[PDB]
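Extended Data, record Putative osmoprotectant uptake system substrate-binding protein OsmF
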Amino acid sequence: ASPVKVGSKIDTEGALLGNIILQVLESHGVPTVNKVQLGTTPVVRGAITSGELDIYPEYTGNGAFFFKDENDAAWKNAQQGYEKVKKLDSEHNKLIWLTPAPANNTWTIAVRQDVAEKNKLTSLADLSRYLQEGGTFKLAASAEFIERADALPAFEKAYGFKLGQDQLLSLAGGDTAVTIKAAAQQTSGVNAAMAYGTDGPVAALGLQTLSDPQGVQPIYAPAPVVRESVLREYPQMAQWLQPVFASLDAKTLQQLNASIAVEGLDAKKVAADYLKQKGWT
């Protein structure tokens, strides 16, 4: 009878996933309070652990910070990271991690679709092979992404490639909308961009993210996290949200995020349309 307080983070994907959770619950007649786009990670995390939120989408790899377990190898594996934060949040905070999306919202490289399809580039390993075969390549990226040891140099080391100076366009202070745009219109001959794994502009501006099978970056997979006492009152909501989040792979999230961020569709309507199309509402 007491309404379920549904939240999310302020960003595009937060708006999308928060509205998805809210509308799934509403379609089952569950009483709700709309607190979508409440704040940043620490604000929503503080809110759910204080009871100001009952459920919101959180990202698996953030378990590294929640449990002071930075540099644990588990966060570099999608399944191991999920299971780890799920176990820890249950026992320590009575927070239940539901089904995670198969997507990984983390740093990667996105390549122009034409170049990716022509050269069969799916993963960062494919990219490395293409480069060592003399493939034409120029990456737009932030100075930070280029220099930080855990960013481009980590990809380079793990996948065995090296970008020369003429294969880089350094853009001072991000952000990925700008680097993606550079590849999209081939600025200074750029054909690839620094991007996040579920970036809306990747879909809208005609790029394709590369996968990270080696697990160089920690995995940030979004999942509903719900207070145990609330799940206790509506146990069925795990079942409701399972096929929904199972369907959210990277390309799907890129398209939905693009609808909102690039083309200015209402996040509420984008969520509603998706749920209706897939037949969950």
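Summary. The domain at 106-219 is CATH 3.40.190.120 (D-Maltodextrin-Binding Protein; domain 2).
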